[PDB]
Design an enzyme around this catalytic site. Structure first.
Site, PDB file in Angstrom:
ATOM      1  CD  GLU B 370      -1.365   2.516   1.847  1.00 14.18           C
ATOM      2  OE1 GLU B 370      -0.218   2.558   2.333  1.00 14.18           O
ATOM      3  OE2 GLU B 370      -2.122   3.517   1.800  1.00 14.18           O
ATOM      4  CB  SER B 574     -27.345  26.406 -19.218  1.00 16.55           C
ATOM      5  OG  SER B 574     -28.429  26.372 -18.259  1.00 16.55           O
ATOM      6  CG  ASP B 610     -29.223  -7.565  -8.021  1.00 18.71           C
ATOM      7  OD1 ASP B 610     -28.529  -7.874  -7.012  1.00 18.71           O
ATOM      8  OD2 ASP B 610     -29.509  -8.369  -8.973  1.00 18.71           O
ATOM      9  CG  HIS B 633     -17.641   7.760  -8.473  1.00 17.97           C
ATOM     10  ND1 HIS B 633     -18.513   8.834  -8.312  1.00 17.97           N
ATOM     11  CD2 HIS B 633     -18.127   6.765  -7.708  1.00 17.97           C
ATOM     12  CE1 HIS B 633     -19.513   8.475  -7.504  1.00 17.97           C
ATOM     13  NE2 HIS B 633     -19.289   7.232  -7.108  1.00 17.97           N
TER      14      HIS B 633
END
Ligand SMILES: *[C@@H]1O[C@H](CO)[C@@H](O[C@@H]2O[C@H](CO)[C@@H](O[C@@H]3O[C@H](CO)[C@@H](O)[C@H](O[C@H]4O[C@H](CO)[C@@H](O)[C@H](O)[C@@H]4O)[C@@H]3O)[C@H](O)[C@H]2NC(C)=O)[C@H](O)[C@H]1NC(C)=O
Ligand SMILES: *[C@@H]1O[C@H](CO)[C@@H](O[C@@H]2O[C@H](CO)[C@@H](O[C@@H]3O[C@H](CO)[C@@H](O)[C@H](O[C@H]4O[C@H](CO)[C@@H](O)[C@H](O)[C@@H]4O)[C@@H]3O)[C@H](O)[C@H]2NC(C)=O)[C@H](O)[C@H]1NC(C)=O
Ligand code: ARK
Ligand code: ARK
Ligand SMILES: *[C@@H]1O[C@H](CO)[C@@H](O[C@@H]2O[C@H](CO)[C@@H](O)[C@H](O)[C@H]2NC(C)=O)[C@H](O)[C@H]1NC(C)=O
Ligand SMILES: *[C@@H]1O[C@H](CO)[C@@H](O[C@@H]2O[C@H](CO)[C@@H](O)[C@H](O)[C@H]2NC(C)=O)[C@H](O)[C@H]1NC(C)=O
Ligand SMILES: *[C@@H]1O[C@H](CO)[C@@H](O[C@@H]2O[C@H](CO)[C@@H](O)[C@H](O)[C@H]2NC(C)=O)[C@H](O)[C@H]1NC(C)=O
Ligand SMILES: *[C@@H]1O[C@H](CO)[C@@H](O[C@@H]2O[C@H](CO)[C@@H](O)[C@H](O)[C@H]2NC(C)=O)[C@H](O)[C@H]1NC(C)=O
Ligand SMILES: *[C@@H]1O[C@H](CO)[C@@H](O[C@@H]2O[C@H](CO)[C@@H](O)[C@H](O)[C@H]2NC(C)=O)[C@H](O)[C@H]1NC(C)=O
Ligand SMILES: *[C@@H]1O[C@H](CO)[C@@H](O[C@@H]2O[C@H](CO)[C@@H](O)[C@H](O)[C@H]2NC(C)=O)[C@H](O)[C@H]1NC(C)=O
Ligand code: NAG
Ligand code: NAG
Ligand code: NAG
Ligand code: NAG
Ligand code: NAG
Ligand code: NAG
Ligand code: CA
Ligand code: CA
Ligand code: CL
Ligand code: CL
Ligand code: ZN
Ligand code: ZN
Ligand code: ZN
Ligand code: ZN
EC number: 3.4.17.21
Lengths: 694, 694
Positions: B370, B574, B610, B633
């Site tokens: 890590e 916009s 789900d 994401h």
């Protein structure tokens, strides 16, 4: 009983015939009012047939049309600039349609505007290997020339990309009687052959799965941000126009320069098929001039989306889709497919009215703008991609139901091979000589698979139709089926009147399928597949069939690489990891199949059905193939040389293609090794989705 | 009964203490034998604790280590080339550890080798805005200079990227007592402050989620094709080295050139904090010279993966993961987290031995490497990405359990806010003054949310830990929790002894948590979350909480854009589509919640579960964010200026950042509009996953 047999018996040839007549009386070009009116009609009828919901999904996408007041044509011009020969401004309309308006004249959709003048070079089918032969062997330079190419063998957009990369300043496409006139048959209206004034319309984009050129990745909705034309995906950079063989003969007959290199370059016209460049001595100062004035325009298109909600698994979708837009009357393409879809919806709707529902949801789609690059199905899939990838069980396409009357043709994922074999054994052959025999028997007899006697041929999917986004981008198991010609005795491509004004209702009714029995059989196959996928308790996919094909494809790509044994030694190029992955897939699939046959538990069932549904999904690589981000399936992609053909292990195949010509072999072989690793990893990862889950 | 309370009561502070002591007696640097031995120990103990299967998953990844026989250091050199001052070769080891070998000396992992000599420029925290101030306001040019930057405020890899883009030829990082020495506390071993010889280790990569630098997208397995170092992802191109404040004072005290621009540039040392470049008059011919000889080396790492198979939904995974590798002894980071994981596995295993199983599968992970860039968790996720995206319910991280002793800290997806509120109301506060009160009460009192009184602060996830691949690449709901300091009275960053040799068992036991009560509370929160996620019939996610935050983030990004009202008018920029999408998400989420509360049907249940599980998944864009393909994401990404901080609507935020400085405003504002469309489309698409499915 409400079972598959009830569903199949309700289908009627006479209904398919009525619907085909109804769909083909006027043109239904994408983006026009007539096609929107047909959308509204289908929507209304699908509601009346009994579907739960039927909506239009619209998008605003780039389309392309000729200028009505400034027609496209090609000329031979003399040294004064006199146009001494002009190609036709329209195809002579067929009998009884000479007063139909709004027939779009032949053009190449998405051609830029221009009036290039130059010397012709004849490039045979304009395939990658034809340009290799011209450039490498014959030493003919296409730079700044107008190229003339015969249609056939590969998708026309690949021809244009190839000409563009050779440096051509324009492309002329024509239909040679060698490829579009079957010996011993008469021209339309007296037979099903292409007359000399007939011309094949069609788009020349190279979208590589992107959909609308201006909005790759996202639906072309009301607020979409659009690229500028200069950054649009897939547009050609040189003008292109198609012509018939009467006009082509006038352009070819004066050709000089080099002879054709061999007979495979000679078509059937009474001309020498000289490669050029330019015309023979007396005519050497004449040139060819194109006049292209078509315009690209963002235009609204409409898909019809019908839903028949599932009784038990409404969040699992089985999709039957095919397009509605046509180049002109669409007698075969697409209305012979759309009439079949219409009758399938009718039959499912009859059962629904009697109280039945399928186990899973069935979605029915009438896609728009398929002819301009699969735009309607791709934009809808972009919009709905999250629902489709987590819920999509299978996609069955439904474009033309017939392209001949000889035997069945199926192209599909290996996961549907067993389903297709089983269904065709339960269906009646419509063929003469096989009355009382199964469709499986007649199909197997007429179209044996190369691999196993007593089995029929089933081809891999490529592209050039609306299953592309579902299969190659999203990884949803897909298939298609139609009646086709005898490929051994028939050397022409597709069917002769493809994309011409002559593709009419009368063409089908008089010459292809007067009783509508081949249409009915195709409705039974497509409809039967949808019924089994939407109703079987266990999804009707056999993972062991994928294992068998993966071994075949691994053998094939290994054999290509082994043409270069010294480079494989030098660069340590090993296929060991790929064969290891395929062996592991074979073993894991075998164990999964035993578990599937050996488990009252609906969680184990659905867990297992999810493993079956997400197996095709596992072959997707979220990084896409090199420079083709919307082709994500690692086992299958449309060939980089011919969008219509599927290629297996496409990433490795393209890394190996023409590798002996690469200037840095270390780099080229490193990319082969990289693609082997990607493929071996993906096959192993897909196998592991079939392992016990914990 | 086997319920959450049984699980929680089995957890013991005294066990966490024993495990922490056991994990911190020797260094466990990634890639070393000692860390492999600890992997094998954990694997054995997890089996004995009762897990169903416990395997090691190994990969061969690029790591970086100093050269044992050619140490890294920095010098001030005079005009003869005499090194008149050298920085330390190691941190003085703490009491009783002066004979431990294999303590890695301070270095910046992945620094290239080099011996650059030059004039210093002091760049404060080396943030984007510090370089803006130097370059745009003070007109100081860093090109060809060595930059010295204080640690703190942002991830050190962003500092290095910023220095590299300013043209620096080397970077020196140091710990200023302003940021790592809390007033009124003594230096280790007498308190928890950083001594002047203490130095913070840490990697300086900019991987943007890629994992192993040589194999982005695919696991670093036995057959992987590796990029060459020149094409590796994220490596710095200039040498970098960290030092403590005794050595920094010797480098800074001679600095001349410009004064600091203001007090926010001044730390606590008795030096002027002059920006430079170079030294004051008498010393103006001295230079600073770095000597970096570290090597990058492909090295094997090992994750331990434990499985506790679910009783009802074994194909749904709830993952509790945290890393095992440390820079030295890892007394806080990571072993205070790993000891907690170990005791959680022990408690679940006790219930398992009594016949219990969770409803869903729980996976427990001890990740490796890590500290070198999230390599172990990322390679395992790359290997298993298809299983995780179709089966992954949630990921709970478990790095350091404590970084203070004041109150709880939680960062998680909005889908887990209600779960966290509910769980903390059922847990006992360990805080003095709150005996008999809930953890929710003490947390809310000490860390109020800015938005709603009577609620606690919960932060967004950024990155810099092993949840990154699960949340930002794969879209699996993720969270983390730990005990933390009082942020108002405490101006230092993280904790003072972060990544130093002084982070020991004694540090924790003497100064942070002598009774192990804060560790126990953290075990209850992490373990309680895993228990609820793995056992609740309905997944414990509330989509209405995402709707509330999405509105907050839309308001925030609209407010940033509205700093430029003339450009918004000129370019027709916009946010209407984005607010429309957020309103629709709010409405659809409200209706979904009513259905969820209002349905004996396990298919509707699982269909609904789900929809809950794939809701986080719906925020993923398979095309990634611009130039950061592994950050997928659309709502959250690590800040482009500070990997530790999360940014909301990152695509729009980065398109707007410093936009008034862009040379082509039309192009820049067009990209803002493109990002608004992407965001509005993704929010609407995510909302539609919650609509009735058919
Ligand atoms: C097909 O499935 C099989 C499983 O049945 C799977 O076999 C796995 O192969 C890998 C790669 O060969 C094996 O990896 C070894 O693992 C051991 C530890 O278990 C390591 O010690 C080995 O590394 C040493 O030896 C190497 C090879 O010479 C050296 O390069 C290295 O430096 C080490 O010295 C090696 O990593 C793995 O053990 C098996 N797993 C099993 C048998 O369960 C195979 O990989 C699958 N095929 C594909 C394409 O995935
Ligand atoms: C939030 O959810 C709502 C649904 O409740 C959803 O509303 C949809 O908005 C779209 C885009 O505005 C509507 O699109 C219109 O659809 C009609 C046909 O139904 C068209 O005729 C309209 O086009 C005409 O008018 C345009 C606008 O001025 C012109 O630009 C155009 O050239 C045409 O003349 C237009 O396409 C759609 O009808 C509704 N759907 C409903 C109400 O069900 C909204 O889009 C959602 N928000 C987001 C961000 O998705
Ligand atoms: O933009 C786009 O991508 C497409 C838009 C539009 N789409 C279409 O018009 N699609 C038509 C395409 C018409 C196909 C023309 N064509 C077919 C081919 C051949 O490739 C087909 C793949 O091989 C499978 C056939 N195999 C056989 C089946 C039976 C058989 N037998 O002897 O009974 C023998 C076969 N065989 O290959 O020898 N080349 N050209 C459609 O999909 O129906 C267009 O192409 O312009
Ligand atoms: O390669 C990589 O990506 C990382 C590898 C390694 N990973 C780590 O070492 N990770 C450590 C990182 C140590 C964090 C140091 N740090 C934290 C920060 C602050 O950002 C945290 C986000 O804000 C949430 C904290 N919010 C508050 C909570 C409570 C509170 N209160 O008053 O009670 C106040 C808060 N607040 O923000 O005011 N800046 N630096 C870990 O994740 O534990 C490394 O960074 O070198
Ligand atoms: C194709 O069939 C449709 C449906 O039967 C015909 O549309 C109908 O036309 C009748 C008579 O004009 C109307 O009263 C109905 O409202 C129509 N139904 C619809 C649109 O669903 C259409 O006339 C046929 N087209 C052709 C060329 O035969
Ligand atoms: C081919 O078409 C062109 C364009 O219509 C013809 O040339 C035009 O002829 C008209 C009438 O003679 C002239 O006024 C225009 O100046 C011409 N335009 C151009 C661009 O040349 C040409 O006559 C036709 N050739 C043949 C054989 O029919
Ligand atoms: C195709 O039909 C075959 C023959 O009926 C099916 O294979 C049988 O499936 C049953 C039910 O599980 C097994 O008990 C038999 O042993 C199978 N016979 C075999 C393999 O020869 C096969 O499942 C069908 N395929 C589908 C529906 O996809
Ligand atoms: C950490 O605890 C482990 C487990 O109790 C210790 O490892 C055990 O050591 C004993 C005595 O040497 C052996 O007989 C066992 O085989 C070991 N068990 C394992 C590896 O699972 C280890 O000694 C402890 N380490 C420290 C530093 O205290
Ligand atoms: C800083 O370290 C350097 C390197 O060890 C020292 O310079 C070396 O000193 C030895 C012995 O005097 C010489 O033989 C080497 O030639 C020197 N190397 C270099 C690179 O200069 C230097 O003396 C040290 N400075 C201080 C203040 O301790
Ligand atoms: C957090 O706890 C609250 C309060 O118990 C839960 O909200 C209740 O859920 C029940 C069961 O569906 C409803 O009937 C109540 O009306 C809810 N009360 C409310 C909303 O005030 C909530 O579901 C829990 N959240 C979780 C477990 O994620
Ligand atoms: C079509 O005809 C001419 C070409 O210049 C002109 O009147 C009109 O602009 C054209 N229409 C287009 C380009 O859409
Ligand atoms: C082909 O001709 C063009 C134009 O004169 C020239 O620029 C190009 O390089 C030539 N290429 C070859 C391979 O002869
Ligand atoms: C239909 O079938 C007959 C019988 O073989 C055949 O001769 C004819 O060519 C077929 N029609 C078409 C369009 O293929
Ligand atoms: C470490 O020390 C020296 C540096 O040149 C040399 O003996 C050895 O090559 C180095 N080790 C490395 C570079 O791994
Ligand atoms: C900074 O200095 C370098 C090196 O002399 C020079 O090349 C660079 O362009 C300068 N930039 C500015 C903004 O002064
Ligand atoms: C532990 O708590 C006490 C009481 O407030 C505090 O003064 C001390 O600073 C804390 N220890 C740490 C390491 O924060
Ligand atoms: Ca699009
Ligand atoms: Ca990797
Ligand atoms: Cl089809
Ligand atoms: Cl954490
Ligand atoms: Zn078609
Ligand atoms: Zn077509
Ligand atoms: Zn850590
Ligand atoms: Zn750390």
């Amino acid at each position: 009983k409400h079972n598959m047999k009830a569903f199949l018996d309700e289908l009627k040839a006479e209904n398919i015939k009525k619907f085909l007549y109804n769909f083909t009386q006027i043109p239904h070009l994408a983006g026009t009012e007539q096609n929107f009116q047909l959308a509204k009609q289908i929507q209304s009828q699908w509601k009346e047939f009994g579907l739960d919901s039927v909506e239009l999904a619209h998008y605003d996408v780039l389309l392309s049309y000729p200028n009505k007041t400034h027609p496209n044509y090609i000329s031979i011009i003399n040294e004064d600039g006199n146009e001494i020969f002009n190609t036709s401004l329209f195809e002579p309309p067929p009998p009884g349609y000479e007063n139909v308006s709004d027939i779009v004249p032949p053009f190449s959709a998405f051609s830029p505007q221009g009036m290039p003048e130059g010397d012709l070079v004849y490039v045979n089918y304009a395939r990658t290997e034809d340009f290799f032969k011209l450039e490498r062997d014959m030493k003919i330079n296409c730079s700044g020339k107008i190229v003339i190419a015969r249609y056939g063998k590969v998708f026309r957009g690949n021809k244009v990309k190839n000409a563009q990369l050779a440096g051509a300043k324009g492309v002329i496409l024509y239909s040679d009687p060698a490829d579009y006139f079957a010996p011993g048959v008469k021209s339309y209206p007296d037979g099903w052959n292409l007359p000399g004034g007939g011309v094949q319309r069609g788009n020349i984009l190279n979208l590589n799965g992107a959909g609308d050129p201006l909005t790759p990745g996202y639906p072309a909705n009301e607020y979409a941000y659009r690229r500028g034309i200069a950054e649009a995906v897939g547009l050609p950079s040189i003008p292109v126009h198609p012509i018939g063989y009467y006009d082509a003969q006038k352009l070819l007959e004066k050709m000089g320069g080099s002879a054709p290199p061999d007979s495979s370059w000679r078509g059937s016209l009474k001309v020498p098929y000289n490669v050029g460049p330019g015309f023979t001595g007396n005519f050497s100062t004449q040139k060819v001039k194109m006049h292209i004035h078509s315009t690209n325009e963002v235009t609204r298109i409409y898909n019809v989306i019908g839903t028949l909600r599932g009784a038990v698994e409404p969040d699992r979708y089985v999709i039957l889709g095919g397009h509605r837009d046509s180049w002109v009357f669409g007698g075969i393409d697409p209305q012979s497919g759309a009439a079949v879809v219409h009758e399938i919806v009718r039959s499912f709707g009859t059962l629904k009215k009697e109280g039945w529902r399928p186990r899973r949801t069935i979605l029915f789609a009438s896609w728009d703008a398929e002819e301009f690059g699969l735009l309607g199905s791709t934009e809808w899939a972009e919009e709905n991609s999250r629902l489709l990838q987590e819920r999509g069980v299978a996609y069955i396409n439904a474009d033309s139901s017939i392209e001949g009357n000889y035997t069945l043709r199926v192209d599909c994922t290996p996961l549907m091979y067993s389903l297709v074999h089983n269904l065709t054994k339960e269906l009646k052959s419509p063929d003469e000589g096989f009355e009382g025999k199964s469709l499986y028997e007649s199909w197997t007899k007429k179209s044996p698979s190369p691999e196993f006697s007593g089995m029929p041929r089933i081809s891999k999917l490529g592209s050039g139709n609306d299953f592309e986004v579902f299969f190659q981008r999203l990884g949803i198991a897909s298939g298609r089926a139609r009646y086709t010609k005898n490929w051994e005795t028939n050397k022409f491509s597709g069917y002769p009147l493809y994309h011409s004004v002559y593709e009419t209702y009368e063409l089908v009714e008089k010459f292809y399928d007067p009783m509508f029995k081949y249409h009915l059989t195709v409705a039974q196959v497509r409809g039967g597949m949808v019924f089994e996928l939407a109703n079987s308790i266990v999804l009707p996919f056999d993972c062991r069939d994928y294992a068998v094909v993966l071994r075949k494809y691994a053998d094939k790509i290994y054999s290509i690489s082994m043409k270069h044994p010294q480079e494989m030694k030098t660069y340590s190029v090993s296929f060991d990891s790929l064969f290891s992955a395929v062996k592991n897939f074979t073993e894991i699939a075998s164990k999964f199949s035993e578990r599937l046959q050996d488990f009252s538990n609906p969680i184990v069932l659905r867990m297992m059905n999810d493993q079956l549904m997400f197996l095709e999904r596992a072959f997707i690589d979220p990084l896409g193939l090199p420079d083709r981000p919307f082709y994500r399936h690692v086992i299958y992609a449309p060939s980089s040389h011919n969008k219509y053909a599927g290629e297996s292990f496409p990433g490795i195949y393209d890394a190996l293609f023409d590798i002996e010509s690469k200037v840095d072999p270390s780099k080229a072989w490193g990319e082969v090794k990289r693609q082997i690793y990607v493929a071996a990893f993906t096959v192993q990862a897909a196998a592991e989705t079939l392992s016990e889950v914990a």
